[PDB]
């Protein structure tokens, strides 16, 4: 277990996956009862606690498919995780989305070579577990949250060579851009476990709008509640 | 239009899309009030009638993304269609599925070059309209139907060069194989309309089991009922 | 057998392959002696009759490589067809060609993934049977018909995303666009049978010119005579 | 001009294109009247003479699409060549072919990236000029030469990494392997000039059979006569 | 400067890039004079100090091309870094390498889509700055260190689907596998700055050998000295 | 061998590889003691003589990866060659380089399909033998020659379809264009022998400047001297 050093049993079957290990710290201290730090390797904090009687873990994943994939592989294969929910921010690429909107990723497009290699150029659609997608949606609805369910783009490239790199994706209905969901969805299917990616729109890549630190924390807190209730 | 010769007005905004024109005839005659044929070009029957007082059309699409894409394009761009539901059969590629199960396609993988060409080799995930997916799922649940929501593979190739062509897809959670869903989902996104593909398992490609003519009809009718209630 | 329901000797070894089943009907009724229907599945009419004492069949194929491929596979593999001649219309992409010109496809370019998958990205040239090409050419010549022998492009996509999709093809000598020849030529080679695709220019995609219905019929009949004399 | 140093009228509009400059010498000295050398750059001999009162040139090309392409480009673009006939040897990849058979390449498959780059991964079929194909065929026929008209594969790679590199090509009807035809047919189309590739089977890549030097000469001379009578 | 929050001027023009932020901490505390922490965002520690009078920074990069690329982009474009040396461990894929050997990456092969996308399928070779490569080699030589200069493979995938994934790379002379160098080398060229990747063999992927914690620290310390002397 | 007809023993282990057989003749006659021709097949001159009492061969390769690859394969596999140094000219694609500069190819980018085919679309970086690279660099330095070590592009295509084909390569640091280095470097790795490609800038593809015949000779001779001292 090279990247997570914890005894077997230290990680719950249900796990939240923020990217930032400090966001994992924040979640554990604010949302979990009796949180226990089980991982410090590479400063990639992982905690285990309880939420309304359910055992839940929260583990930083790092940025991009290659990093997140290492943690996901180890969590599933070595620690026996079964329900993986990524919680994150994303940049909106259509004006149909507003700042602070919640996006639940039905599928994840990608520019990564991950599946081009696996399927020899054929097209595999990495998808959310429908049961999780459905219940997360119901949770957001019951809170009156602006929520969209649809496509995201998982990019390898935060900083593209050219401007307006997402125009074509938007024309084909893609809602927002992040960097990991395609990897999570593909690995979940590979191992036959369940996964979901939930996102809050922190930036609007079309209007140039940005969320204030107060706005971020408020909608972030709500997202975490949704994930914890779903899981 | 070149392939549908009816005037604007003859075709309803909500449309069922079977592949076989004789299935279009069947659906129209058995499930719609006052069905009237609007198209005979290439024997590709299209009908319009009413369901619970609202107009619904039913149009044969032919087999494969290239044929279906012609009809879908014309229906949306020339006939103003807004809600497009494919109903069809599919071959199960996993033992998790049984004959007569309903599959609702959350997304559609493909071996077609359609999106490889459009996205210069990057990976686009053709997806269902979530609202239609959700409503169809709830419809199937309310009837106690065995139903799965997940991936299907839209193939160009009914007869593959080698045996076991679908095993890698199945290993990554793909439920069933058909030939059009990826086209429907991509074009719906292209035009900003709604789409869904619902399928009944008529053939099991792992077990070799096959439904009787009597069995086919019974579950097909049920699928049509689900589709009409989803509009 | 799944898409053609006829007994094993119902189809002749020589077969004309229009796309539109209503054109198959027309050909049977007007050019064959004792035409008898052998298929009605999916309204995809097929007939067998005689021409100058020899059995000939005529079978609708539907549009695009995926559809046509299903029929061609079944015809060759189950029904023992040996000589397959596609007769169709095409759109000219060069002003070197005029409306009503006959084009005999020496080979067929494609945007389909069928051979990219088969040959792992290498380039396979789907070609006509030379003997049939030569015989058809001599037939057109003997009638003083304006005829060209060269490349066609078989596209998956009747409706392209952007304007002027065929310019580069034309710069490299491609004469006209249709949707099936590449599939026909590839499968004929796969099974070691003989094939040819003959086309009438019905639309000029550069000049926007279109043939009248009377013009379509006169040249179409001529093409059919050429095809029948070639088999 | 950088690879052929001759004045602008030194080269004839009709040109034979063997690969080996020493074969160009042989052809000039044995089949042409008043042969005169016009090129010595890189030892890539080119000659102009007459055949039955009409000027004909013969120019060495070197091996492979990159080399041959340099000569073909310069010949067409700087020297005004219009009719280019490659005469060469090839390896048969099907037992349907025998040593000493003549193959006239109707088209040329390739593993070169030349058209994958040009057509962004779509498939272009490089083809012979039909008029030249037909005339050469009639010439071979008139001499009772065993002749086949069909596909060849132009490879970048004389020495493949693994055994049996050509099996799949042969399964799809490809007759023989050489290294230039695809480049010749593509550039002839690029510039709107006429081209043909004629080949003698010198080696059988299936049976391991090889022609004796005496056999090579007799059939080679025959091929040259056919080429000269075709231009 | 989203991922590194430091004032401009806080980062030296010369920077070491370990992957693990705790390795950056180790380097700063053991090799640098007056080390100052300038970054804590995402626990991705970055320090600035001096080495033998030279101002040097050390910054954690995270794992994989997507993560490392974010930091590299920001360091170069926002902080003005000019000399970037990645120091890391790698797994050897040839028995010509021994545990504890030093590898200096002359170039970096990859399975990432980074350059396939940029160059539209053409092949770009990401390379080290020769001056750095040369001087690092001279530094290792003067210490009598077992050192190899050549290819590495930068993979997206720590955990491959199949076993023996590196056999073909090894057959073409590739020395070792890591996850970032191709990204570093490509970005360095993109921005016209200088880069190098130096690696110690911590694991042997062929023999299954592994380094002891004492062995790792000893050869690691040596590598850091080499990098600091080179920079 | 098929393309080099000399016995084993005639060819030395160290070999210079110009492209032009007349350059091979030049090198042999002007730089070697007792040069003796060993090959005349296809006018592709090869010589063996001595340099400072050790045998050195010189062999023409032709133009492009397919031709050069034939000779390289035969030299290594049949003639036992162990050290292969290409000497040639190249076109500069950056203003950083001046006419008459020496370029030593650290690696070779390519548009050839050679490695795309071998590595199923992943990216292999063809590299020089570092020891030869280092020694050649030191040789050039000792003579005060303007020398650069870095990337070159090996193209299949001397005459591109559109203007400015090399600008993207230049933006990513590529120094100069030639047609063979990528082949030489890949095959050397394939066979586990040494290789290096040294080039003089004879043409500037940005400025359009060109060296005089007198200039070419002077810097060419110097390059040969460097090459012979590198053995
Ligand atoms: Mg209702
Ligand atoms: Mg010496």
Automatic annotation (TrEMBL), chains A, B, C, D, E, F:
Organism taxonomic ancestry: Bacteria, Thermotogati, Deinococcota, Deinococci, Thermales
Q: What is its EC number?
A: 2.4.2.3
Q: Does the keyword Transferase apply?
A: yes
Q: What class of enzyme is it?
A: transferase
Which residue ranges does UniProt annotate as crossing the membrane? Answer: none
Q: Which stretches make up the Nucleoside phosphorylase domain?
A: 15-225
Statement: the UniProt record of this protein carries the keyword Glycosyltransferase: yes
Return the PROSITE patterns for the record. PNP_UDP_1
Q: What is this protein called?
A: Uridine phosphorylase
One GO cellular component term, please give it. Answer: cytosol
Pfam families linked: PNP_UDP_1
Single GO biological process annotation from the record: purine nucleoside catabolic process
User: Could you tell me what reaction this enzyme catalyses?
Assistant: uridine + phosphate = alpha-D-ribose 1-phosphate + uracil
InterPro entries the UniProt entry points to: DeoD-type, Nucleoside_phosphorylase_CS, Nucleoside_phosphorylase_d, Nucleoside_phosphorylase_sf
**Membership in a protein family:** Belongs to the PNP/UDP phosphorylase family.
Q: Which GO terms describe its molecular function?
A: purine-nucleoside phosphorylase activity; uridine phosphorylase activity
Q: Which organism is it from?
A: Meiothermus ruber (strain ATCC 35948 / DSM 1279 / VKM B-1258 / 21)
Keywords for the protein's UniProt record, in alphabetical order = Glycosyltransferase, Transferase
Matches recorded under PANTHER family = FI09636P-RELATED (PTHR43691:SF11), URIDINE PHOSPHORYLASE (PTHR43691)
